[PDB]
Amino acid sequence: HMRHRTLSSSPALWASIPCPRSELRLDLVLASGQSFRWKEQSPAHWSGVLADQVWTLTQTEDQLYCTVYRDDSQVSRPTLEELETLHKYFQLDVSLAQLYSHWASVDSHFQRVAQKFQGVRLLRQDPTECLFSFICSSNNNIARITGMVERLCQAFGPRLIQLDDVTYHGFPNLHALAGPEAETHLRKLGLGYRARYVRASAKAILEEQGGPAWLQQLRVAPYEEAHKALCTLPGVGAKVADCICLMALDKPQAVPVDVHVWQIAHRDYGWHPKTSQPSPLANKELGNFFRNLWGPYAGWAQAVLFSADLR
Amino acid sequence: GSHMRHRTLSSSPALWASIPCPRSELRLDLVLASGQSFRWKEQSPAHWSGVLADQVWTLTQTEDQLYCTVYRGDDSQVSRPTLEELETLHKYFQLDVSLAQLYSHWASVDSHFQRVAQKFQGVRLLRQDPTECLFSFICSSNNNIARITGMVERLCQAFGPRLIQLDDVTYHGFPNLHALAGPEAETHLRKLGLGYRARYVRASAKAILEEQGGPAWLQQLRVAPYEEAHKALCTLPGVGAKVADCICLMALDKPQAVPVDVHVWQIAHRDYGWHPKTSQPSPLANKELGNFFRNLWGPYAGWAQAVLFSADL
Amino acid sequence: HMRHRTLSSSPALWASIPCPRSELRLDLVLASGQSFRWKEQSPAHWSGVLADQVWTLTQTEDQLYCTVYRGDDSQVSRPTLEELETLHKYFQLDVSLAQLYSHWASVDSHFQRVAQKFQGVRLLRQDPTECLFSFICSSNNNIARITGMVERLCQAFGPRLIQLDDVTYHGFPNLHALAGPEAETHLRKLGLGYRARYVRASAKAILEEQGGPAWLQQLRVAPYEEAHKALCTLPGVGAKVADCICLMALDKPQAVPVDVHVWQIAHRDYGWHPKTSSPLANKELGNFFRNLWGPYAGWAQAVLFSADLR
Ligand SMILES: c1ccc2c(NC3CCCCC3)nc(C3CC3)nc2c1
Ligand SMILES: c1ccc2c(NC3CCCCC3)nc(C3CC3)nc2c1
Ligand SMILES: c1ccc2c(NC3CCCCC3)nc(C3CC3)nc2c1
Ligand code: NI
């Protein structure tokens, strides 16, 4: 029985990435409603599936410490290209320090909240895992979504490894979710109505869009074109589209709007629609408001306010 | 006879009957002094003493048990509450109604409630005497809880029957209608600290006796539907739409009734993003905010308000 | 050069004003966006410049302790009666905070809740000049920065006074000094940006068009409405900066500066929307707080501002 590593337990299996806590705070990012695959299995030691490998992540004030679980290879530390993966996943080329400052210069309200909530950045997620994760997110909470994605992976995705009493499965491919008994199984796993959307969307991306290459096209396509493309999918509206756009298709300006963004905007910015009334048009107006205020990284600024308003 | 004291748990161990009441179904320190009834006081820590009908009680609680004692009088032999007297509490605290059934329903329709409710479990509605509630709430307009608590005592002393003394506290029942309808009622009331409202107390009392006849009518309104009752009470002088909604929710078993004022309006706007679908507070806009909370929360909307009110306070 | 005093270090050089902690809390007043010239060099020991003298201040539950530095100029000694009377007026200690809080609480339920943990928040009576130019540097700016801007502005144009430890102190510049031809370039080199334009222009404008620093004293006598209009005619002085000066230097307690932050508080905590289709709306919000709080509405605002920054 292999067990979840800690930094003091076999430090001969950890590689480091020079990362200030001001740049990245794992405890405000990993289980804060972006990915649902990260668990604090032991204190300050976050374990989760990236691609087809398990990771455990921990950090000091100066460094990001990480180790990978590949029975397969000989027990060893993360390779160079595997460290490059984490660097990209956390989008560390981008300075959060400078973005925080740029947003603070125009938003008095962000200045106060951001003081207490440093190191909140956007993960760069796999489009497929991101799409189905957020189809599961409708009228749902982070704990229930975490449960539905785990069961989904254990039932459809391949087994990678077991660490303690935790079995880790990779995210299933479209074809595994598109099958004739997929909806019926996903309903047994407790997804309710979200079971129809998951199977249906898996089918639509294969037959009607030409499989996962389509999601890579959207990643390169402009924001507005990708958003409209996503909205053609079963169970994917403006909100889920903007979530995927922001977190998986490199559209930092994407601002997902629901009744909770409405609440923040109204209470904290005194925002009202300059129309009639939450409608599709007014939700779009709210998204424009924040883009006009914070600029082309409005979505990353939203991740800081959301992550804060969750504590 | 013997000098009687306020009973605590250690003081009177054989003089306490217990009703199994989960602290999650009733937190006494969030109901008894939260602007519902003004007649309950924490004479010793965790111990609540006050009048029900024409008998003084003391109450306190653990996690599973609601502990209660009765001061019948110096006259009657010193005994523990009878079975019929432990029903009177059960009906007063409307403990038939399940708070976990309701807290869960409100949480399922209202995201905001869920974050508030977690730290304020056990908030329910007392089934008050329609008479007591009405005359307590006519003097409520534009006054805080502490001021009305005094008003209702000095009122109860002057016009109410002396029941018993416990320590240095003289407990009186709530006056009957006749007592308040007397010609000099306004003078004593005006002297006591009550404003022009003294006339409205005397008037509404004299008016209740003039047409209705007395407390028979207030039981007709308790069985009558919300529509008829709210309008009926709004005929009485000093009785607006708010005081009518308070009395309706707290005495006449109208769980749906939502009393609206500037503070409700404040919460509605800040926590729910509410603006009137009409003019830019008003009678119709207040009635709209009432409809809004009914249409969101259900037929126990007044009870939901009570949680947030007692949370805000 | 010399050292920063503590009350326990050299007790001889400290005079004392009777003033309960409830009537004044230095830690909520001295670095809360009124004055940018006081720093807490030692815990409960705030040092800064008034007129052309350096002070350190500390307090107990009933005593405001103070000590003054006239430079190496004269012999070391404790504050005079005059200097104590100067310090009395600066904190406007004639005005009962207990009574104002009582009134505000009686007419505003929100204030009653917020005030509880933020007693002793009163308003300084600043020199018009120091105030005008400190709040010209305030546009699109936060306290920490404005402190720096004003310090560098003072170091560069300020009459030198004394050094206490590492810190060297400077008096506030006069108009003549700030209305100099190469004054903007210097202020731009000290990182004031566009504000440098406004400082020089206003400094020059007052001297020539309005007739010396006398003009600013004439507004302390003048009513709020005339005072506020007069200030808006100055470069880089709009409705908000004018109201700031009026409230904190011109003895108009009813003055309520309105910006986007006051808007958000007003909307969230009072449910305020304009009855309009912003200048006219800014003015309406000012009248709202005057109508709610009364003739010391600016002081009430100061309690909420100093609360909503902790
Ligand atoms: C369940 C799980 C996650 C979320 C979520 N995540 C945000 C998305 C924008 C980047 C930061 C994370 N956002 C929202 C609303 C848009 C605010 N609802 C959720 C419901
Ligand atoms: C003085 C005394 C008591 C109250 C009061 N009591 C509430 C009413 C609903 C159940 C909880 C108690 N409510 C209100 C407003 C409706 C919010 N104002 C008062 C003014
Ligand atoms: C930078 C520095 C100071 C302030 C400031 N100070 C207040 C002024 C009213 C009395 C108390 C202090 N106010 C405001 C807003 C109008 C409320 N903005 C500032 C921006
Ligand atoms: Ni609004």
SS3 readout for B91-135: HHCCCCCCHHHHHHHHHHHCHHHHHHHCCCCCCCCCCCCHHHHHH
User: Contact A45/A58 with Cβ under 8 angstroms?
Assistant: yes
Question: Which are the catalytic amino acids of A?
Answer: 239
Q: Give the pairing of strands B17-20 and B41-44.
A: unpaired
User: Contact A20/A84 with Cβ under 8 angstroms?
Assistant: no
Residue B111: its chain A contacts at CB < 8 A?
Answer: 259-260
Question: What is the C-alpha separation between B58 and B70, in angstroms, rounded?
Answer: 7
Q: Of A47, A244, A54, A45, whose CA–CA distance to A158 is shortest?
A: A54
Q: Is C56 helix (H, G, I), strand (E, B) or coil?
A: strand
**Sheet (strand C63-69) strand order:** C15-18, C63-69, C53-59, C45-50, C38-42
Question: What is the C-alpha separation between A191 and A185, in angstroms, rounded?
Answer: 9
Residue A262: its chain B contacts at CB < 8 A?
Answer: 273
Smallest Cβ distance to A262: which of B270, B273, B275? B273
Q: Of A14, A127, A23, whose CA–CA distance to A75 is shortest?
A: A14
> What is chain C's Cα-based Rg?
20
C-alpha distance from B276 to closest chain C C-alpha (Å): 12
C275 near B CB under 8 A? yes
Q: Give the pairing of strands B65-71 and B17-20.
A: antiparallel
Question: What is the C-alpha separation between B102 and C240, in angstroms, rounded?
Answer: 49
Q: Which two tokens stand for residue C210?
A: 């309005």
Question: What is the C-alpha separation between C35 and C25, in angstroms, rounded?
Answer: 14
Cα B92 to chain centroid, rounded = 10
Q: Which two tokens stand for residue B145?
A: 């809880």
Residue listed under structure tokens 């299995």: A41
Helices (H), B118-235: 130-138, 145-159, 177-181, 185-192, 197-210, 215-223, 226-234
Q: What is the identity of the amino acid at A117?
A: F
> Is A306 known to sit in a ligand binding site?
yes
**C92 dihedral zone (left: phi>0; alpha: psi -120 to 50; beta):** left
Question: What is the C-alpha separation between A146 and C94, in angstroms, rounded?
Answer: 62
Question: What is the C-alpha separation between A311 and A91, in angstroms, rounded?
Answer: 24
C-alpha distance from C258 to closest chain A C-alpha (Å): 14
Residue listed under structure tokens 């007044």: B302
Discontinuities in chain A (C→N > 2.5 Å), after residue: 70, 277
Burial class (CB in 10 A: 0-12, 13-18, 19+), B32: buried
Q: Is A186 helix (H, G, I), strand (E, B) or coil?
A: helix
Q: Please, what sign has the CA dihedral across residues A292, A297, A302, A305?
A: negative
Q: Which two tokens stand for residue C175?
A: 């108009």
Question: What is the C-alpha separation between C282 and C260, in angstroms, rounded?
Answer: 9
* 3-class SS shares of chain C: helix, strand, coil, % to 5: 50, 15, 40
Q: Which residues contact C113 (CB under 8 A, 6 or more apart)?
A: none
Question: Among the atoms of ligand 1, which is closest to the Cα of residue A142?
Answer: 2
Residue C268: its chain A contacts at CB < 8 A?
Answer: 267-268, 270
Q: Give the pairing of strands A39-42 and A45-50.
A: antiparallel
Q: Of B81, B93, B69, B55, whose CA–CA distance to B9 is shortest?
A: B69
Q: Which two tokens stand for residue C305?
A: 């501002």
Q: Whole-angstrom distance between the N-terminal and C-terminal Cα of chain C?
A: 35
Question: What is the C-alpha separation between B43 and B57, in angstroms, rounded?
Answer: 12
Cα B167 to chain centroid, rounded = 25
CATH number corresponding to A94-114+255-310: 1.10.1670.10
Q: Which residues contact B305 (CB under 8 A, 6 or more apart)?
A: B258, B259, B264, B293, B297
A279 near B CB under 8 A? no
Q: Of B252, B246, B239, whose CA–CA distance to B204 is shortest?
A: B239
Q: Of A105, A118, A110, whose CA–CA distance to A269 is shortest?
A: A110
Question: What is the C-alpha separation between A11 and A182, in angstroms, rounded?
Answer: 42
User: Contact C7/C14 with Cβ under 8 angstroms?
Assistant: yes
Helices (H), chain A: 80-89, 96-104, 108-116, 127-135, 142-156, 174-177, 182-188, 194-207, 213-220, 223-231, 238-248, 259-269, 280-294, 298-308
CATH number corresponding to C127-252: 1.10.340.30
Q: Is C106 helix (H, G, I), strand (E, B) or coil?
A: helix
Judge: domain A1-90, CATH 3.40.50.720: no
Question: Among the atoms of ligand 1, which is closest to the Cα of residue A32?
Answer: 12
Question: H/E element holding C302?
Answer: helix C297-307
A115 near C CB under 8 A? no
Question: What is the C-alpha separation between A244 and A130, in angstroms, rounded?
Answer: 6
Q: Which residues contact A293 (CB under 8 A, 6 or more apart)?
A: A106, A107
Question: Among the atoms of ligand 1, which is closest to the Cα of residue A36?
Answer: 2
Question: H/E element holding B248?
Answer: helix B242-250
Q: Which two tokens stand for residue B284?
A: 């119709």
Instruction: Identify the residue whose C-alpha is closest to ligand 1 atom 4.
Output: A33
CA distances from residue B239 to B140, B201, B243, C73 in whole angstroms, order as listed: 10, 10, 6, 75
Cα A260 to chain centroid, rounded = 18
**Phi, psi (deg, nearest 5) at residue C86:** -55, -45
Residue listed under structure tokens 């016009």: B159
Bridge partners for C42 per DSSP: C45
> Taking CA A28 as the corner, what is the angle to CA A21 and CA A159, rounded to the nearest 5 degrees?
105
What one-character-per-residue DSSP string does B23-62 give? Answer: TTT--GGGTTTSSS-S--EEEETTEEEEEETTEEEEEEE-
Q: Of C172, C177, C186, C232, whose CA–CA distance to C204 is shortest?
A: C177
Question: What is the C-alpha separation between B157 and B191, in angstroms, rounded?
Answer: 14
Determine how many CB atoms are found less than 10 A away from the CB of residue A138: 17
Resolution in A: 2.6
Question: What is the C-alpha separation between C74 and B33, in angstroms, rounded?
Answer: 65
CA distances from residue C27 to B55, B175, C165 in whole angstroms, order as listed: 54, 54, 22
Residue listed under structure tokens 């007003």: C266
Residue listed under structure tokens 């006219």: C280
Q: Which residues contact C189 (CB under 8 A, 6 or more apart)?
A: none
Q: Which two tokens stand for residue C241?
A: 């900066």
Q: What is the identity of the amino acid at C42?
A: S
Technique that determined the structure: X-ray
Q: Which CATH architecture has domain B129-254?
A: Orthogonal Bundle (1.10)
Question: What is the C-alpha separation between B236 and B222, in angstroms, rounded?
Answer: 16
Cα C237 to chain centroid, rounded = 16
Q: Which two tokens stand for residue C53?
A: 């003298």
Q: Please, what sign has the CA dihedral across residues C148, C153, C154, C155?
A: positive
B282 near C CB under 8 A? no
Which of A35, A120, A243 has most ligand 1 atoms within 8 Å of CB, for mutation? Answer: A243
Determine how many CB atoms are found less than 10 A away from the CB of residue C106: 10
> Which class is domain B3-93?
alpha beta
Bridge partners for A113 per DSSP: none
Q: Residues B41, B91, B231, B242: which is the catalytic one?
A: B242
Q: Is B286 helix (H, G, I), strand (E, B) or coil?
A: helix
- From the candidate CATH numbers 3.40.190.10, 3.20.20.80, 3.30.310.40, 3.30.360.10, the one assigned to the domain spanning C1-91: 3.30.310.40
Q: Of B228, B256, B221, B18, whose CA–CA distance to B125 is shortest?
A: B256
A310 near B CB under 8 A? no
Q: Which two tokens stand for residue C138?
A: 């305030």
Q: Is B230 helix (H, G, I), strand (E, B) or coil?
A: helix
User: Contact C309/A109 with Cβ under 8 angstroms?
Assistant: no
Judge: domain A126-251, CATH 3.40.50.10490: no
Question: H/E element holding C88?
Answer: helix C81-90
Q: Which two tokens stand for residue A267?
A: 């209470």
Residue listed under structure tokens 């959307």: A197
Discontinuities in chain B (C→N > 2.5 Å), after residue: 280
Question: H/E element holding C37?
Answer: none
Q: Give, to the nearest 10 degrees, the angle between helix C128-136 and helix C214-221.
A: 100
User: Contact A262/A253 with Cβ under 8 angstroms?
Assistant: no
Q: Of A59, A53, A17, A23, whose CA–CA distance to A37 is shortest?
A: A53
User: Contact A48/A55 with Cβ under 8 angstroms?
Assistant: yes
User: Contact B229/B241 with Cβ under 8 angstroms?
Assistant: no
Q: What is the identity of the amino acid at C218?
A: Q
Discontinuities in chain C (C→N > 2.5 Å), after residue: 277
Q: Which two tokens stand for residue C252?
A: 């108009």
CATH number corresponding to B97-117+258-313: 1.10.1670.10
Question: What is the C-alpha separation between A199 and C148, in angstroms, rounded?
Answer: 60
Determine how many CB atoms are found less than 10 A away from the CB of residue A159: 11
Q: Which two tokens stand for residue C95?
A: 């005005």
Q: Which two tokens stand for residue A73?
A: 């290879």
CA distances from residue B56 to B39, B45, B136 in whole angstroms, order as listed: 10, 18, 18
> Is A258 known to sit in a ligand binding site?
yes
User: Contact B54/B65 with Cβ under 8 angstroms?
Assistant: no
User: Contact A288/B294 with Cβ under 8 angstroms?
Assistant: no
Question: What is the C-alpha separation between B181 and B264, in angstroms, rounded?
Answer: 33
User: Contact B66/B156 with Cβ under 8 angstroms?
Assistant: no
> What is chain B's Cα-based Rg?
20
Determine how many CB atoms are found less than 10 A away from the CB of residue B311: 18
Residue to test with chain B: of C109, C265, C275, C276, most B Cβ within 10 A: C109
| Maximal C-alpha separation, chain B | 66
What one-character-per-residue DSSP string does A249-279 give? Answer: S--TT-----HHHHHHHHHHH----SS----
For ligand 2, say whether the CB of B35 is within 6 Å of any of its atoms: yes
What one-character-per-residue DSSP string does C121-184 give? Answer: -------HHHHHHHHHTTTT--HHHHHHHHHHHHHHHSPEEEEETTEEEEPPP-HHHHT-TTHH
Residue-range domain boundaries for chain A: 1-90, 94-114+255-310, 126-251
CA distances from residue A18 to A54, A120, A291, B119, B236 in whole angstroms, order as listed: 21, 17, 31, 41, 75
Q: Which two tokens stand for residue C165?
A: 């430890």
Question: What is the C-alpha separation between C190 and C151, in angstroms, rounded?
Answer: 10
Question: What is the C-alpha separation between B35 and B311, in angstroms, rounded?
Answer: 12
B111 near A CB under 8 A? yes
Q: Which two tokens stand for residue A211?
A: 């499989």
Q: Whole-angstrom distance between the N-terminal and C-terminal Cα of chain B?
A: 42
Q: Give, to the nearest 10 degrees, the angle between helix B145-159 and helix B130-138.
A: 120
Domain C95-115+256-309 belongs to what topology? Endonuclease Iii, domain 2 (1.10.1670)
**A270 dihedral zone (left: phi>0; alpha: psi -120 to 50; beta):** left
Long-range pairs, A7-11, Cβ under 8 A, ≥24:
A7/A45, A7/A58, A7/A65, A10/A75
Q: What is the identity of the amino acid at C202?
A: S
CA distances from residue A265 to A23, A124, A290, C104, C132 in whole angstroms, order as listed: 26, 26, 9, 29, 34
Q: Is A246 helix (H, G, I), strand (E, B) or coil?
A: helix
Question: Which are the catalytic amino acids of C?
Answer: 240
> What is chain A's Cα-based Rg?
20
CA distances from residue C105 to B198, C99, C253, C302, C306 in whole angstroms, order as listed: 27, 10, 17, 14, 16
Residue B233 CA to ligand 2 center (angstroms) comes to 17
Residue C189 CA to ligand 2 center (angstroms) comes to 60
Q: Which residues contact B17 (CB under 8 A, 6 or more apart)?
A: B67, B68, B69, B80, B81, B86
Long-range pairs, A96-102, Cβ under 8 A, ≥24:
A96/A22, A96/A23, A96/A24, A96/A120, A96/A121, A97/A22, A97/A23, A99/A297, A99/A300, A99/A301, A100/A304, A102/A295, A102/A297
Residue listed under structure tokens 């009459």: C159
Question: What is the C-alpha separation between B24 and B99, in angstroms, rounded?
Answer: 8
Indicate which ligand has the atom closest to the C-alpha of A267.
4
Q: Give, to the nearest 10 degrees, the angle between helix B301-312 and helix B242-250.
A: 100
Residue to test with chain A: of B108, B111, B112, B115, most A Cβ within 10 A: B111
Torsion of CA A167, A168, A174, A180, to 10 degrees: 0
